[PDB]
Design a protein around this nucleic acid. Structure first.
Ligand code: MG
Ligand code: MG
Ligand code: MG
Ligand code: MG
Ligand code: MG
Ligand code: MG
Ligand code: MG
Ligand code: MG
Ligand code: MG
Ligand code: MG
Ligand code: ZN
Lengths: 83, 57, 116, 178
RNA sequence: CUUCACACAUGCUACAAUGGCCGGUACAAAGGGCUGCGAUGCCGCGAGGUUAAGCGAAUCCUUAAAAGCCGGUCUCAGUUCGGAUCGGGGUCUGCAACUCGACCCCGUGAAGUCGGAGUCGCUAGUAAUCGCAGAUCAGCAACGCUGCGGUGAAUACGUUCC
């Protein structure tokens, strides 16, 4: 949790779902509701339809989104240029 | 026509901090030229997010 | 004289002249001077080529200079743009990224008052 | 005696002969001339390039340049016919040899962020062209007595008939390529 | 509930030499404190972390007051003024800090050079200026609120005029 004393912050009910699938395969579209979980270097090749308030945003990590967060890629608000 | 038009072109000598020194004829400066980098010392003549997360955690 | 930039404002202490390089400011210049030994309070016109050539290698040994630092900065922001995060989208829209309010501010990131 | 010319006549000619099996000794590529020009934009405004271009090109090169006047009139550039827009000089012989030696030795590495001359800027016939964008690092000219900054370009013309031969000749002469 | 082509209102910052930086240096009040005040000591430039004594308190912490004074530098400059923005790196609370916290380190270093018509507050320890404490709260308040203290002025002839 942004401190070099406990490692990163990854949800246990997320690990027990990702680590039981990454052993054999990259699972298909998955449902998640905790935008606050950090991306450990185990999500490579997988997808996560992260909630943003009204729906789920499917996000794929290729190589670089390891220090990011799941909700970082889900627009929580929508703005479309008043003019 | 070379009477008064062309600038002076007289023998000179280049002294470099590296040590590469050669003598040619240069313009109005008749003295020496002090330089710090030459062809023998300049570069180009003598030549991950996951890793960052690993070293962070 | 020139190491990477001009680095020589006329009649200036080289302590502050080192701040004119892209990568060194007050603290970086102070720590560099502390390591090297040359005193801070001296006019830049009195500096000599030997001192310049011992100073030239130190900056490239550990610190960085014009060109490559801005290349790294632009590569970072460009990667942020192409990856498509919240910060990348804010950079694409030109809006400030660090959670600052946008109702009555962000005039630096945007332009002055448009007054449409 | 031009040291670069002596080095050329000593070994570069033989190197080119080995690289390309010329049937006669004068089929070997040789640099003919070096041309440096301004092409300033302050032709329709303030019309002051005799001090802006000539006074620096003369000391940079070694000979006073020739003034080139406009060949036409362009309203978009505010270009009229008859006033100088560019100043061109050409360097040949031992003067060209010395200029090329001084360039390749001290001037080319000494500009900002020198990452090497691109080896793809050939004209297709065996002559190369590249240009800077400011008052060059030539020690012959110092910033303390220069007006508004202006860059320049070089055309180097060789006896080579092919781009590969021109590139090989420049590489042997000492042009830092990619 | 914190959005963002824009406008308003209330506060802070400056636009510098009554000044900036470096070193030394003296004088407060009123408050807070067992889900705490963490005296020293150690690590780290740093915020902070570690073991630990005293303290339900005139005996412990807060606790160093800043403005004030001395010596050097800068020499009127978009600057040794200005700290908004941005990149990288850490700390603290919180299960969790992109949205959606505060602080620390480096570098980058914008507008701004006294602000139009117009408009606000102020008669004595007042205005002016600089710091301190509380309440909310795990963190978010040295830009809000409420109180505290230091230095500390000029004008009022007169009530015709808004
Ligand atoms: Mg609100
Ligand atoms: Mg306020
Ligand atoms: Mg400052
Ligand atoms: Mg001090
Ligand atoms: Mg310490
Ligand atoms: Mg001024
Ligand atoms: Mg301005
Ligand atoms: Mg500033
Ligand atoms: Mg006014
Ligand atoms: Mg509080
Ligand atoms: Zn050298």
């Amino acid at each position: 949790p942004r401190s070099l004393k406990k490692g990163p912050f990854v949800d246990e009910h997320l690990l027990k779902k990702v680590d039981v699938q990454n052993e054999k395969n990259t699972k298909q579209v998955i449902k998640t509701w905790s935008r606050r979980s950090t991306i450990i270097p185990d999500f490579i090749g997988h997808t996560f339809a992260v909630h943003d308030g009204r729906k789920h945003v499917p996000v794929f990590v290729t190589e670089s989104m390891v220090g990011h967060k799941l909700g970082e890629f889900a627009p929580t608000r929508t703005f479309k240029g008043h003019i | 026509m070379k009477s008064d038009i062309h600038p002076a072109y007289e023998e000179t000598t280049v002294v470099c901090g590296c040590g590469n020194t050669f003598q040619t004829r240069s313009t109005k400066p008749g003295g020496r030229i002090v330089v710090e980098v030459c062809s023998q010392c300049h570069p180009f003549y003598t030549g991950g997010r996951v890793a960052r997360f690993e070293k962070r955690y | 004289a020139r190491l990477v930039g001009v680095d020589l404002p006329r009649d200036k202490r080289m302590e502050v002249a080192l701040t004119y390089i892209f990568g060194i400011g007050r603290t970086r210049s102070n720590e560099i001077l502390a390591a090297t030994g040359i005193d801070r309070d001296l006019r830049t016109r009195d500096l000599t080529e030997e001192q310049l050539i011992h100073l030239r290698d130190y900056i490239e040994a550990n610190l960085k200079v014009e060109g490559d630092l801005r290349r790294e900065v632009q590569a970072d922001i460009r990667r942020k743009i192409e990856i498509g995060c919240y910060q990348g989208l804010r950079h694409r829209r030109g809006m400030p990224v660090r959670g600052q309010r946008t109702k009555t501010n962000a005039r630096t990131r945007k332009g002055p008052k448009r007054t449409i | 005696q031009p040291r670069l010319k002596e080095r050329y006549r000593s070994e570069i000619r033989d190197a080119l002969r080995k690289q390309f099996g010329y049937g006669n000794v004068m089929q070997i590529p040789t640099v003919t001339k070096v041309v440096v020009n301004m092409g300033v934009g302050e032709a329709a405004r303030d019309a002051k390039l005799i001090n802006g271009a000539v006074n620096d090109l003369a000391l940079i090169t070694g000979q006073k340049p020739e003034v080139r006047r406009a060949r036409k009139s362009i309203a978009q550039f505010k270009l009229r016919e008859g006033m100088p827009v560019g100043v061109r000089v050409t360097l040949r012989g031992d003067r060209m040899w010395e200029f090329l030696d001084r360039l390749t030795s001290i001037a080319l590495p000494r500009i900002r962020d020198f990452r090497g001359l691109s080896p793809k800027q050939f004209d297709g016939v065996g002559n190369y062209t590249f240009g800077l964008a400011e008052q060059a690092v030539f020690h012959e000219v110092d910033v303390d007595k220069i007006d508004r900054v202006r860059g320049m370009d070089i055309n180097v013309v060789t006896s080579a008939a092919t781009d590969d031969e021109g590139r090989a000749l420049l590489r042997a002469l000492g042009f830092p390529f990619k």
